[PDB]
Amino acid sequence: QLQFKDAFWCRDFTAHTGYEVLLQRLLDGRKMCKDMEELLRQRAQAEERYGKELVQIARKAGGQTEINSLRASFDSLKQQMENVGSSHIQLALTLREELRSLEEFRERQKEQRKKYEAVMDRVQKSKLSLYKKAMESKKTYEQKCRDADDAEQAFERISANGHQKQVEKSQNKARQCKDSATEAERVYRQSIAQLEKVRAEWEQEHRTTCEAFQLQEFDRLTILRNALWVHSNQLSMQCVKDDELYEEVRLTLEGCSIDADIDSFIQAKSTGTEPPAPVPYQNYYD
Amino acid sequence: LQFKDAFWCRDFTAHTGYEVLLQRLLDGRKMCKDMEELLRQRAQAEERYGKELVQIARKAGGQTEINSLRASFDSLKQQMENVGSSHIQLALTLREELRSLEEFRERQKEQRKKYEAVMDRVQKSKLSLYKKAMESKKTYEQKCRDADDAEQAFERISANGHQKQVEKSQNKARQCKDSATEAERVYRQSIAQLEKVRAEWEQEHRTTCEAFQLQEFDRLTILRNALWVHSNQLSMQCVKDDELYEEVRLTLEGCSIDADIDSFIQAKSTGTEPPAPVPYQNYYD
């Protein structure tokens, strides 16, 4: 039980603080989406540099002087290092795609937000404009009523024993002043009528904008929460990929027998199984 | 299946068996260096990677967010630094393994040089006395040929030659036979001196082979173990990071979209009633 429409009004007729607070929340939401975008961007750059560095270490690493099992195990470690480095380079492209998804979502909400801003700014400007005119008409109407009352009181004063020419002067003046009070009343009634029509338009627009702004925040909170859940899974998935790649190094080490490598080197590089015969004395005549 | 019984040479002057084994130790030393450089470069990569993760976490924003989504974002920032700090610790772990192999490699070089000096000394003496024995054989056989030419010259003229000439050639043949006998003793002694050194070389060669085989058994064991430990430490880093990333998902489970919307409304609400319309006010009422 909480809605933007029912909870962002203002008793002050000339105040639009409710709309301003909601519009500020959207601006704060836009900044939050940018901060999520920048974190993915920098993280992708960290993954790319890290992935490329792992690949370079694997390619340029040595081990050519080793043979048999230990050579295969070392070549297996180099091979899996390149696989991890390439996988982290692939992760950088994945994060940059998530960055592009939020990037176009942020601009899509800005386009729809600007449309509501133009409507509200127009109707609020007109509401305050006609309210100012109605108060100016109200002041004139109340001044004309005072003029009409004082003009009639002046006529009744001199109508008692005043001269006929003087009495007729105040009577025609009071009639002219009383008509001006009627005309000022019609203009004041018209100003109130014009203000009422715009006020009902503003209240309908404000309720419409509140429902729309709440939908924009519900969508933004949902997609940002989803972005964090997907980002955490993609990073956790990278740990599982790497652990499986490092498992291939351990699988190669399982077939690494120290005694087998020693026997393999002996059989391949053996020179002789018999020591040289001693040099004996040779008689020249026998 | 032993180094001693399988690295001899029928050629008396050949020590190829020892040279092949020493070449294998040099190839093993280079392999240990290559394992050292792989750990060094990997440690440098982990440190650079870890430090960058920390910097991204510290400098990341999100200050405009509130309630659950802010806490979830702060959880990712906090765990990113935890992962980055853990990778810096991994670099120090790999550098200690690098230092462990480095001191094993230098301890084997010191012991190898000691066996190299012993074998080089006895092999140099073995070839030296063999050369002297062959030089003595050449002189002994040359003195025998001189004795043969001295006896044939006497026997040629001993038939009908003059008494003075026959007695002259007889004394020459007697002196040539004496030189062959004296040269024979020098040749016999050279063979005797060479034989004692040869038996010493055979005992040294067998001892050095067992030592070189023990050095290879130690090197293969520590290098195979180093690969096994290195793979486990990298796999341990994947498990640590997954546990740190698990804290981000645990924070997201308590992230309710409706709760954050309600929290903003309760905190920033301005009014529940729209403003009353402006009515016509009669000056006389």
Author numbering:
A (entry chain B): 4 to 289
B (entry chain A): 5 to 289
Lines quoted from the article behind this entry:
PSTPIP1 is an adaptor protein expressed in most immune cell lineages. It presents two structural domains in its sequence, an N-terminal Fer/CIP4 homology-Bin/Amphiphysin/Rvs (F-BAR) domain and a C-terminal SH3 domain, connected by a linker region. The F-BAR domain of PSTPIP1 binds to the PEST subfamily of protein tyrosine phosphatases (PTPs): PTPN12, also known as PTP-PEST, PTPN18, and the lymphoid phosphatase (LYP), encoded by the gene PTPN22. Positively charged residues on the concave surface of F-BAR domains interact with the polar heads of the phospholipids in the cellular membrane.
We determined the previously unknown structure of the isolated F-BAR domain of PSTPIP1. To better understand the molecular basis of the physiological function of PSTPIP1 in the immune system, and its role in autoinflammatory diseases, we elucidated the 3D structure of the F-BAR domain (residues 1–289) using X-ray crystallography. Initially, we solved the structure of the G258A mutant, and subsequently that of the wild type protein. The two structures were almost identical. After superimposition, the root mean square deviation (rmsd) between all the equivalent Cα atoms was 0.275 Ǻ, which was similar to the estimated errors of the coordinates of the structures (0.23–0.24 Ǻ). The asymmetric unit of the crystal contains two molecules of PSTPIP1 that form the characteristic elongated crescent-shape of F-BAR dimers. The concave side of the F-BAR dimer is overall electropositive and contains two clusters of basic residues in each protomer, one in the core region, and the other near the tip of the wing. On the other hand, the central area of the convex surface has strong electronegative character due to the presence of multiple acidic residues. Large acidic surfaces are observed in the F-BAR domains of other proteins, such as Cdc15, growth arrest-specific 7 (GAS7), and formin-binding protein 17 (FBP17), but are absent in several F-BAR domains. The residues of PSTPIP1 critical for binding to PEST phosphatases (see above) are located in this electronegative area, supporting the notion that the acidic convex area is important for PSTPIP1 function. Finally, the conformation of the PSTPIP1 residues involved in LYP binding is very similar in the free and bound structures.
